[PDB]
């Protein structure tokens, strides 16, 4: 009787949170994700990443990144 | 992969972001959520909210953070 159920659903989220090093204010999102991923972190963690990769890749598609990329070309190589 | 149609998936993701007024770094989450909610914001917005309520509701029950409105801070107060 001491171990409840809902508290556990949050436990799993606590991991999906510390793993992605997210602040404590993003708990409602780790909650829905696990809610859709059958709460299987091994599955949900595979979604967020596939997500980070999307967002991070999406932008790099429009070349809208003034970071220190440095090496940036295609096909063979311009000349530098 | 599958560009064009992918740009829109970000359009919905954006609303889910501005509506909850989330920073630009939480796009990978608004991405997974819509991915399972058929990307139907009207369907996902129901999860996140029900999510904010869970975390928010789950907290006021133990009075963890939810803003103290008092012992929050102090900095200084040497008036007299």
From Swiss-Prot, chains A, B:
The gene is dsx. Experimentally shown to bind zinc. This is Protein doublesex. It is found in: Nucleus. Signal peptide: none annotated. Controls somatic sexual differentiation. Binds directly and specifically to the FBE (fat body enhancer) of the yolk protein 1 and 2 genes (Yp1 and Yp2). This enhancer is sufficient to direct the female-specific transcription characteristic of the Yp genes in adult fat bodies. Involved in regulation of male-specific expression of takeout in brain-associated fat body. It comes from Drosophila melanogaster. The chain holds residues 350 to 422 of 549 of the full protein.
């Amino acid at each position: 009787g001491s171990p409840l159920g809902q508290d556990v659903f949050l436990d799993y989220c606590q991991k999906l949170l510390e793993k992605f090093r997210y602040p404590w204010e993003l708990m409602p999102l780790m909650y829905v994700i696990l809610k859709d991923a059958d709460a299987n972190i091994e599955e949900a963690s595979r979604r967020i990443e596939e997500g980070q990769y999307v967002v991070n890749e999406y932008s790099r598609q429009h070349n809208l990144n003034i970071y220190d990329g440095g090496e940036l070309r295609n096909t063979t190589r311009q000349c530098g």
